[PDB]
Amino acid sequence: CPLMVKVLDAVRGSPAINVAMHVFRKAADDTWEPFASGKTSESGELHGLTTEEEFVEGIYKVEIDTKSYWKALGISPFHEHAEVVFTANDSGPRRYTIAALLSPYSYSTTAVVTNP
Amino acid sequence: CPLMVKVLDAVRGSPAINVAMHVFRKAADDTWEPFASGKTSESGELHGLTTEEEFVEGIYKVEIDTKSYWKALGISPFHEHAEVVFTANDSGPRRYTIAALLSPYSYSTTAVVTNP
Amino acid sequence: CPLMVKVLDAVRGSPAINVAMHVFRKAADDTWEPFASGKTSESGELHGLTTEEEFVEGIYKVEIDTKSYWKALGISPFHEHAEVVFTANDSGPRRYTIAALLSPYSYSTTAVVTNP
Amino acid sequence: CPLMVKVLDAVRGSPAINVAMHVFRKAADDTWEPFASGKTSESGELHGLTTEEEFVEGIYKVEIDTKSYWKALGISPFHEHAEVVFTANDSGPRRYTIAALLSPYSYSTTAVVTNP
Ligand SMILES: COc1cc(O)cc(/C=C/c2ccc(O)cc2)c1
Ligand SMILES: COc1cc(O)cc(/C=C/c2ccc(O)cc2)c1
Ligand code: NA
Ligand code: NA
Ligand code: NA
Ligand code: NA
């Protein structure tokens, strides 16, 4: 899996299910071009975003709609979304797992990068 | 001081000093307009970004240049920046403290929102 | 898996491999009785700590030797260990995943609790 | 003030006020001796726990009573407490700020260590 995103709920102690996100790749003119998208499964995971051959060097942005997640639970959260912006594949292919841990007024994110 | 940002270094156990950041505000055409910028002090804090009169309702983005911070220490980090995007002052004026805790492959951010 | 522990390295962007931990259960006299132990795999995970029938209500402590992990990388960390203390199984069996994200001067921990 | 503790609430976006904590110091027989205790103020801070003369080299544990904090808000949290165990002052006197960011099923802790 070249790119996987895992989202956890720090309030309820559960995967964060049905969390929507879009992935963009920065174009030569500094605009954000659409690249991938999806929503998390019952395990809190989103797999299948891209393929190795399509996922080349670039600056990528994962924009996670955390606000909709909290609003569906009746909570007015702080953030509009959680963003993760990173250069990928600049030393050739790697496998990336982006994890996000969500609370209404806070998020934490980490990456695991593995060489195939 | 209705907006303050504090940045901590989870590797060295210190404030994150001389970290640059830029603040943007979403315009009516949905573009990001420059709003303020600055660098953290020896305490890891950036004060004086705005004023009560200038800090109107809106969607704001703080982009913290974590990449330059790590690179100056000889570390090639994961993220291009740490981002915080939030609606401010929509129920009247509030004071916001944004805190960020930085590691090379992870960051955590929280907000403290107070009604004066 | 009644109890699994997953450990991640926020500095290197990797699983934290070969991290040792012991699990204790609080006895009636408030002392900590040995309960389980192991070290993380190449995936950063420790499975097989207990079985459903052995893992009953109690206060459990997972004591993770983070200091040895950092010292092996030539780093003098802040914490002696990372501890996670929690009541488990007070409403009957659950499955617990404890995750820890490590930096030299910081750790973050979360739990995912699932009803079988 | 060589030891200060600051506690933040990631759910409400506020300092964590009136949070109790106890500090222990490891004795020569490896038992935990009571060292100091207190409660956080309206700013989420606990100052005045110790003095330069009293805060000798040793292994210290801060146990923050997060369980009572969440229960008072009607939340049944995961952890019994948030724990920070560390060696202090082994290379001479330092000033320590321990920060903790709390959610019902997660906590994050960091240290800022300064040489006066
Ligand atoms: C005065 O020392 C301070 C002041 C302050 O406003 C915040 C913090 C810590 C914030 C923080 C963020 C994220 C984390 O994961 C863990 C702590 C420490
Ligand atoms: C439960 O299974 C998993 C799989 C995984 O890849 C990561 C995590 C936790 C990530 C995480 C992020 C931020 C934090 O502050 C603390 C943990 C948990
Ligand atoms: Na390259
Ligand atoms: Na309004
Ligand atoms: Na019960
Ligand atoms: Na010494």
Side-chain angles (χ1 to χ4, degrees), chain D residues 1-82 84-116:
Chain D
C1 197
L3 179 63
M4 187 271 274
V5 184
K6 184 159 177 78
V7 191
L8 296 177
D9 178 332
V11 172
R12 299 198 289 169
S14 61
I17 301 170
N18 277 299
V19 175
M21 68 193 77
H22 292 254
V23 189
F24 305 86
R25 180 179 181 280
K26 189 160 278 174
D29 64 2
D30 289 326
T31 207
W32 288 114
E33 298 266 26
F35 182 77
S37 64
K39 275 197 210 309
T40 60
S41 70
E42 309 272 89
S43 69
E45 298 176 8
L46 174 51
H47 296 263
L49 281 164
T50 189
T51 68
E52 292 72 14
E53 292 72 25
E54 175 184 58
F55 190 43
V56 296
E57 285 191 72
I59 300 177
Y60 292 83
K61 174 171 63 165
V62 182
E63 290 192 345
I64 305 176
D65 180 12
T66 58
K67 187 178 185 182
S68 296
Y69 179 80
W70 293 118
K71 288 187 111 65
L73 306 174
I75 293 161
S76 190
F78 181 71
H79 302 94
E80 289 295 299
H81 57 262
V84 180
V85 184
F86 64 106
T87 297
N89 306 307
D90 55 339
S91 303
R94 300 290 184 273
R95 292 180 191 158
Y96 296 85
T97 297
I98 303 297
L101 178 63
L102 307 184
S103 301
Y105 275 69
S106 180
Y107 66 91
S108 176
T109 190
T110 197
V112 176
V113 184
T114 66
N115 186 345

Side-chain angles (χ1 to χ4, degrees), chain A residues 6 8 97 99-101 108-110, chain C residues 6 8 97 99 101 108-110 112:
Chain A
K6 183 162 182 72
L8 296 177
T97 297
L101 178 62
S108 178
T109 186
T110 198
Chain C
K6 183 162 182 72
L8 296 177
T97 297
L101 178 62
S108 178
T109 186
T110 198
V112 177

